[PDB]
């Protein structure tokens, strides 16, 4: 469950980083917390 447009990709960081393709942006914190 994540903001419309954002992709969840699991990196070797043991971390899923959030990535929006329509605005070209990446986040470690869920973009719902930072809009």
């Amino acid at each position: 469950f994540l903001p419309k447009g954002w992709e969840v990709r699991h990196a070797p960081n043991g971390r899923p980083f959030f990535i929006d393709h329509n605005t070209k942006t990446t986040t470690w914190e869920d973009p719902r917390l930072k809009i």
């Binding site: 992709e7 990196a11 960081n13 980083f17 990535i19 393709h21 070209k24 942006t25 990446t26 470690w28």
Partner: peptide, 9 residues
């Protein structure tokens, strides 16, 4: 840590 530069099309 370490943010990735974004460009995914």
């Amino acid at each position: 840590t370490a943010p990735p530069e974004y460009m995914e099309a």
